[PDB]
């Protein structure tokens, strides 16, 4: 279990440590919110990917996946949020937020959905 989280979080590629949560525990059927930080005043686009299958979930301000439970939004000037509206145990695993910036920043988040 520790190795699985480490294998996820080792995938971060960033100039400065991720300032946001990178381990998210939620109860099944509740929503989850994964955060991706971007510099102030930049105009970068971001993409969220699910690592287990490589599925592209969102790209830019559009959802890409056809799974209706996912939405991306700008929470504030510096924070994008991937919202998973009704988490299930099968959603547990590694998620990545990639930024189209010059250093090709990648943030990794591990999601654990607890099944009662």
């Amino acid at each position: 279990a520790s190795e699985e989280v480490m294998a996820c979080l080792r995938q971060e590629r960033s100039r400065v440590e991720n300032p946001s949560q990178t381990i998210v525990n939620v109860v099944a059927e509740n929503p989850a919110y994964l955060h991706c930080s971007v510099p102030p005043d930049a105009e970068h686009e971001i993409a969220w990917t699910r690592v287990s299958d490589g599925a592209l979930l969102t790209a830019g301000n559009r959802t890409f996946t056809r799974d209706p439970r996912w939405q991306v939004s700008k929470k504030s000037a510096n924070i994008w949020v991937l919202n998973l509206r009704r988490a299930e145990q099968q959603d547990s695993g590694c998620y990545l937020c990639e930024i189209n910036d010059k250093h090709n920043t990648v943030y990794a988040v591990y999601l654990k959905v607890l099944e009662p």
Binding site: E45, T49, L56, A59
Partner: protein
């Protein structure tokens, strides 16, 4: 009729010479309202294009959607290939489960 399929020959594995341009072709039938993404399947994986848009390094990649005789070939060109471009490239259709085709690029240096 049928769900989206990736038709042979797609995402052909290749060895290229340093500096060549390399095309990866994803032939998609019955795409319907689905969308196609190209990804570099490194660890972490890297998004190259989604739908009709290139996501990074605009002068490095070119995407040509729906070309060929039957308007069903999606061609990603990697320009001026380098050792850093070595690895696996995947075409993905956003079905659930996803529909994938992958090919490996080798790059030979003089």
């Amino acid at each position: 009729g049928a769900p989206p399929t990736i038709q042979q020959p797609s995402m052909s594995s290749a060895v290229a010479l340093l500096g060549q341009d390399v095309d990866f072709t994803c032939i998609v039938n019955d795409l319907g309202s689905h969308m196609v993404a190209f990804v570099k399947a490194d660890s972490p994986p890297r998004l190259l294009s989604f739908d009709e848009k290139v996501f990074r390094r605009r002068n490095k990649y070119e995407l040509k959607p729906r070309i060929g005789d039957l308007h069903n070939e999606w061609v990603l060109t990697i320009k001026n290939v380098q050792e850093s471009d070595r690895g696996n490239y995947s075409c993905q259709i956003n079905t659930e489960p996803i529909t994938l085709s992958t090919g490996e690029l080798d790059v030979k240096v003089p």
